[PDB]
Amino acid sequence: MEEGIAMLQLANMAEAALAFEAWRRLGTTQAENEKDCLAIIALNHARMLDPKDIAVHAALAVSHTNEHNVGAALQSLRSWLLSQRDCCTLLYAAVEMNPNDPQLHASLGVLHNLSHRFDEAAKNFRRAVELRPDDAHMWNKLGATLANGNRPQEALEAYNRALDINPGYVRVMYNMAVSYSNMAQYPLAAKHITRAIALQAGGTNPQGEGSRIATRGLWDLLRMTLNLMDRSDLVEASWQQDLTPFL
Amino acid sequence: MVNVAVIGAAGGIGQSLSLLLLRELPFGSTLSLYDVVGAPGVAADLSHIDRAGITVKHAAGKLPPVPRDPALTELAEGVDVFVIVAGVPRDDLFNVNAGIVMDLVLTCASVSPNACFCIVTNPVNSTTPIAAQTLRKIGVYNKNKLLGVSLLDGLRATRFINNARHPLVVPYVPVVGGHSDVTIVPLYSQIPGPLPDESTLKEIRKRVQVAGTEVVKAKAGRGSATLSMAEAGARFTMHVVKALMGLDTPMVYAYVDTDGEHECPFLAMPVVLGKNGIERRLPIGPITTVEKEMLEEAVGVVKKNIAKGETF
Amino acid sequence: MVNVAVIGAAGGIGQSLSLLLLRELPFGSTLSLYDVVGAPGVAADLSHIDRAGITVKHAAGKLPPVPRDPALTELAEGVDVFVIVAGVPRDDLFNVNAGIVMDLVLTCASVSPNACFCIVTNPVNSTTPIAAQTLRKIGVYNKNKLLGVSLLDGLRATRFINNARHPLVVPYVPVVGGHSDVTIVPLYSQIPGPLPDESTLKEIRKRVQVAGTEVVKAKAGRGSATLSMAEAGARFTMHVVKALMGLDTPMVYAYVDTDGEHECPFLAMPVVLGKNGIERRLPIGPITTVEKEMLEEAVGVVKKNIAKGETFARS
Amino acid sequence: MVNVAVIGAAGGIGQSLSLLLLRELPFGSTLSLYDVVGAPGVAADLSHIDRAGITVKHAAGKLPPVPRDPALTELAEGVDVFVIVAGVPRDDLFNVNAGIVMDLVLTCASVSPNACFCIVTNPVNSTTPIAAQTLRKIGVYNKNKLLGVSLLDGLRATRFINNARHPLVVPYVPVVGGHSDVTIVPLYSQIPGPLPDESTLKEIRKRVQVAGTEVVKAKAGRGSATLSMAEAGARFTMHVVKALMGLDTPMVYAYVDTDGEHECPFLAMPVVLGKNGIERRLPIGPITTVEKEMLEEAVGVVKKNIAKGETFAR
Amino acid sequence: MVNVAVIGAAGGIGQSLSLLLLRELPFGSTLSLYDVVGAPGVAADLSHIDRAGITVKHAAGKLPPVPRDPALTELAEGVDVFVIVAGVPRDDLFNVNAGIVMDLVLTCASVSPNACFCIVTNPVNSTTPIAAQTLRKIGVYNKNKLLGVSLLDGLRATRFINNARHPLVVPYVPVVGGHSDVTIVPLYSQIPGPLPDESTLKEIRKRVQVAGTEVVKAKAGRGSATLSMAEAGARFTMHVVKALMGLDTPMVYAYVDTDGEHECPFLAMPVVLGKNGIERRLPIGPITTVEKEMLEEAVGVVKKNIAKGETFAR
C-alpha cells in the first residue's frame, strides 16, 4: 500500500503493480501497461466491492472503449453518471447542468471516441485538458484521440509533455510508436517499442502468464515494424524475447 | 451444396446482393445472412420468394457491436463461401472499415478455416492484405482461397468501350493494377477489333479511373454506387460458387496474392478458378508503352497502399 | 423495341425493380427512370453496368412536388409500358397515395395514351379503379391495358405449399379475389398432387392472407416487404413486355377490369396476355365448398374497396 | 461428375440422342458410346464440337454379334445412367428386340449394378418387365432405378391440346397407362383452363393413340419417328441426370414398377425423381367416367402385354 | 416474325439441323422444309414435338429432279433466310453440287430476292461465288446478304486448343482464309493467354487442316461428319436469325464477299451482323510471321477456287 503509493510517484509501475481501494489502484495502474485484461478484471473486482466508486466506473469505461466494447463502455458511463444515444442525452444534460466539470468533458470525449466522431472528442478533450493542465491521463486520452483521428501533427503538445509530467507512461511510448509508424518513421518507432518493453519488464522481471500475454502484442508490433525495414537479424533475435540486442 | 454467407446483408449493397444471389444460386444450396441490425427483416423478406430448392438462414445482430459475436460463431458453421460486405456508408474511411474487417474475419475463420473469403469492403488495396494478416495470425491461411472483388472496374471498362465502338461488342475487358483512383489500368490493347484512336482512348481510361467520383457527385454527396457493386459482387460470388462445385473453371481478374511472380505482393492479375480455390495465376501478357508507363506508376501506389494496410 | 418507364424509381422498391429489369430487358430496349428525388443518382449507377444493347434515360422532378411535372411529360413520350411504383413509406396512407397515383397517371397518359399501365403501389383493390377513373376522365380508357400487380400472393402461396409438400414441387398456385388482407383466396384444389390435409391447408391459407404484416413485425415496424415486391413487379413487367413484342402468350393472374363475367367489376382472375394487352378472360374454374364462402367474403369486401376508391377519385 | 452410356448410339435414334446429350450434359460429365458397328465414326464426329468440359469415350463393336462382348464389359465400368436405344430398323420384331435387350442388360448390369437403366426401345410394355427379370436373375434388381421412357405420348398430347386451345398454352399433359396404341390414356380433365367441347376431345385422344402410325404412313413405310423419339429420350435422360446430381427433384411420368398402388405390376404413373432413383410414387388422381373406362381397357391390355413379356424371359 | 427455309431437310445433315433449329428458334417463327425425297416424313416428325409458337411447313418435289420445281416456288414465298444443305453424298462431286446449288438458288431467289442465303454445301470456296454469279444473272445481288458457313473450322480449332491448354478454356478462336485443306489458317496468336509453345502449335494447326479427313477415315469411307456440320450450321443460322430482328449484333467469321479490303474477292474475314445482313467488315488484324506465310499460301488457292467456280458459272 504505502510502498505502492511512494513508488508510483517516481514514474515506474511494474514494481508497484507487482507489490499489490487497493483493487482500484491496481486496476488503474494496470490500465497503463497495455494489460487491459488484468486491469478490467481488477476493475470488476473493485466494482463488486464498491459500485459507488466513480473512478472505478471511469477506468472501466476507458478500458472498454480501448477494447472496442461499445455496450460495456456505455453501461460503465451510465453507472458513473448515476453514482453521483440516451446515454448521450444523459451526458449532455449533465454537461449543461455543470459546464465546468473536467470529468464530464473527459466522459464526453470518451463517448465520442468510440462513436467514430473524432472531432467532437478532440474538442471535448481539449476543453477538459485546458480546465486541468496537470492531469497526465487527460492529455493521454486527448493524444490518443488525435492519433486515432489521423494526421499526427504536433508530435505531441502533451502526452509527451505528460511525459514531462509522468515520464514512465508506457502508453506514451506505445502511441508515439504507432504515430511514427503512421508517418513511416520506423527506427525511432522501434526504439519507442523497445523502451516500452523495457519499462514493462522493469527490474524484478515478472514472468507471469498474463504479463507475457500482454507483452506479446508489443513484441508482435516490434516484429512487424522490423519487417518493413528488412531487419531480419533483429526479427530472428525477437523470437527469444531478448531486448538486450535491441537496447 | 454450398453454403454462402453474406455478412452485412442489411446494408445498401448487401440487400441487393442477397436478392441477386437468391435467384442465381444452384438448386440445393443455402443462403446465410448476418448483420448487426436489420437481418431478421431481410431474412423474412427473401423467404417469401418461391425459389424451390433454396433455404434461407439468418443470425440476429446484437447490442452495440461486441467482439467475437456468438451469433456469427453459430451462423458461420459449415460455410463454404464468405462475402465480407460491411462498413460505414476520405482517410477516416480506412481505420473504421479495417477494424470491423479484422473482427469479422477473426470471428468467421475460427470455425470455418477452409472457406473462401471474398472482400467487398471499400479500401480494396488495403483491406485484402489486412484480411490476410488477420488470417496469418490465427495460423490458417490459403493464398488460393482469399480474393478481392474488383469486377466493377472491368464492368465499367467494358461498358465504356462498347459505347464508343457500336455495333462491335466485346464481352469483357482486361483490367489490372488495383481498385482505386490511379491504380486502375485498363488493358484495351488485348481485345479484338480496331481500337478507336489515341487521345480518345486516353479519355476513356481516365473516365474508368475516376468513374466512382461521378456517381457520388451525381447523388449530391449522399451515397455511393450500390447497385453496380452489388451486381459485381453477385457475379464474382456466382463464379466462385460454380468453380467450387466443379461446374466451371472460369478465368477472372481478382485482387489476389501474387505467389512469387510479380514483385508486388498483392497485385490484381488474371487467375483461373477451380475446386481448390485458385488453380493457375496467368501472366499479365504483352502491353504497349503507354500501358507500361501506367502500370509502372500504379505499382508504386499499390505498394504504398499494401504497406499502409499491413502496418495497421 | 420496347420503352419501359419506371415511375418512382429512386425509392426502396423502385431501385431493386429497376436493377432487376436492366438485367432482363431484351436486347435493344430502353429504361426511363423518374423520381422527384434521387433520379439522376440511380440513373448514373445502372449506366456503368455493361449490359450491351440497352440504353438508360432519366428525368428529375422538383423538390416541391408540382402537379403535371414538365419533366415527366418529356420523359413519357414514346413509352410502351408504365410501371407506377410510387408511394410514401390505414386511412392516412390511402389519402396520400391515391392523389399521387391520380396525378402520375394523368400526367403520363396525356402524351402516351396507348401505353399499358402496371400499378405497383399498394391499396390495390382501391388504386386500380382510381387509375381507370382518371383514364376515363382523360378520354381514353382501354380495359385490356390496365393491370394491377397482385403476383406477390402467388409467390407466397407457391413457397408455402412447396415447403409443406417437399420434395414434390409445383411451379405456381392460382390466387383469385383481391389483394389486401382477407380478399386473398388461394386455390390449392386445382394444382397437381395429393394435397396435405384439411385443418392444415387452413393455416397455410391464413398465413398467406396475413403474410404481409409478418414482415413488418419482423422489421420492428421500421418498414415493409421491399425485396419480394420488387421481384414480383419485375416478373410481371417481364411477362407484359415479352407478350407485347410477340415473344410469348403467358397466362397470368392480375387485378384487371372484369368486363361482363363476374359481378364484381374489378376482380383478380386468370388472363392471357398478347400483342394488345389482354386477349382472353378465363373463368375461375371448379371450386370446393370451403373456397366458395371464402370467395363470397372476398368479393363482398372488394366491392366496398372499389366503391371507396371510386368515391375518392370522383371528389 | 456423371457417366452416361448410350448403347446402340450409331443408329438413327442414337445419333440424335447423343448429339442432344452432348449439347445438354452438365460440365464435367463424360459420354460413352457403344454399338456393334459405326461407334468409332460417331465418336470421332462428336469429339470435334468444342463443348468445353465434356469428354467422349467409345467402344467399338465386334464381328457378327456375340453374347457378352468384352468391349461393352470394358466400357460399362463406372457408368451412372444406361440409355438403351437398340433395335432392328410384328411379333418377330418383338422377339429380336427382346433377345437383344436381355443380353444388353445382362452385360451392362454385371459390372455396374447400381446404375439407372432407361429403356428407350419400342415394345416398352414387354421390354421393361424383361429387363426387370434379367436384373432379378443377376441378383441386383432395384425397382426405384429402372425407368421406361414414355415421354413421346406426353409431347404429342401437349402439342395437340396446345394446337386446339390456342393461345392458351400448357407446359405438359398427364398421360397414364402404357406406350402402345390402345394402352395410353391422356388425362385432359386435370389440366388448367377451359377444355373444348366433347366429341372433339375424343378425336384428339384417338389421334394421340394412333399418332405413331401416322409418321410411318407419311414415310411411305420406309422408317419411323426417329427425331421426336430421340428428343423425348434426351429430355428424360437429362431429367434423370439432373435428379441424380442433386440439382432437381422433378415429377415425371414413366413406365415403372408398381409396388402396391395399382393392381397392374408395371403401370405408367407419375413419380418424383431424386438422388436414389424413384422417391415418391403419386396416385393417378381424380378422373372422369370416360377416362375411367379408357383406363380399364388399357389396364386389361397391359395385363396381357406384361404376361407376354415375362413369358419370353423363361 | 421470321421464316426459315431448310433446303435438303431429309438428308443426313438437314435432319439434325432441322431438329436443332426447331429446338432453338424463337416464339412465333415458322420452319419450312424441302427435299426431293423424304420431306413429307420429316415434317410430320417435328410437328409432334410441342414447341409452342412454331409452325412446321413443308413441300415435296418430284422424285425426278426438274428445273424450277413448282413446289419449291410456293414454299419460297415469304422466306427470310435460306439454308442450302442440299448435296449428294473430287470434281465429280463439284460439278453436280454446283448444278444443284445453281438450280436451287435460281428457284428460291426468284420469289424472295431480299432473303439471306447461307451456303452449307461442301465446296464452300467454289460454290459461294457460284451462288453470287447466279444472283447476279437473276438481277438482284446483295453482298451483305450472302454468306458461306465456315464455323466448323472454328469449332475444331477451339476444341483442340482447349484440349491442349486445359486448366483453362477460351470461348472462340479466330480462323481466316478458307475452308478446304490448306485454305484454313487458324490465328492462335489473337487468343488471350499463354500459348502451348511452337512445334506443337504447328501440329495443332495441321490437325485443324486435316481433321475433316480423319472422321471419314474412322468411318472406313462410309460417310463424313454429319453431326458436326449440322451443329455448326444450326449455330450460324441462329446467329443470323437473332441479328435479323435486332436481338443481337454478333461478330462472326464467315466466307463472305470483300468489296475491297483484301485483294482476294471472297476471303473468310470476320464480320459484324445486323438488321440488314453484314453491318461491318473488320480487318484481319496483326499476325505473326508464320501466320502471314500461311495466309499468303492460302490466298493463292482461294483465288483459283473462286476462278473455277466463276468459270463453271459461265
Author numbering:
A (entry chain E): 363 to 382, 394 to 457, 494 to 656
B (entry chain B): 1 to 89, 96 to 318
C (entry chain C): 1 to 89, 96 to 321
D (entry chain A), E (entry chain D): 1 to 89, 96 to 320
Authors' own words:
Peroxisome targeting sequence 1 (PTS1)-tagged cargo is recognized by cytosolic receptor, Pex5. The cargo-Pex5 complex docks at the peroxisomal membrane translocon, composed of Pex14 and Pex13, facilitating translocation into the peroxisomal lumen.
We successfully reconstructed MP1 and MP2 maps showing one and two copies of Pex5 bound to MDH tetramer, respectively. MP1 and MP2 maps show a well-resolved MDH region, but poorly resolved Pex5 region(s), indicating conformational heterogeneity in the latter component. The refined maps facilitated model building of MDH and Pex5 residues 327–462 and 487–653, encompassing the TPR domain and an upstream helix containing the Wxxx(F/Y) motif (residues 327–345). The helix distinguishes our structure from previously available Pex5 TPR domain crystal structures, in which the Wxxx(F/Y) motif-containing helix is not resolved. Recognition of the MDH by Pex5 is mediated via PTS1 motif at the central cavity of Pex5 TPR domain. Along PTS1-mediated interaction, two additional interfaces between MDH and Pex5 TPR domain are identified by PISA analysis. Interface 1 involves MDH residues 62–70 and Pex5 residues 439–444, forming a loop connecting α6 and α7. To clarify the ambiguity, we reconstituted in vitro and solved the structure of the MDH-Pex5 binary complex devoid of Pex14NTD. The map for the binary complex revealed no density beyond the MDH and Pex5 TPR domain, indicating that the additional density observed in the ternary complex originates from Pex14NTD.
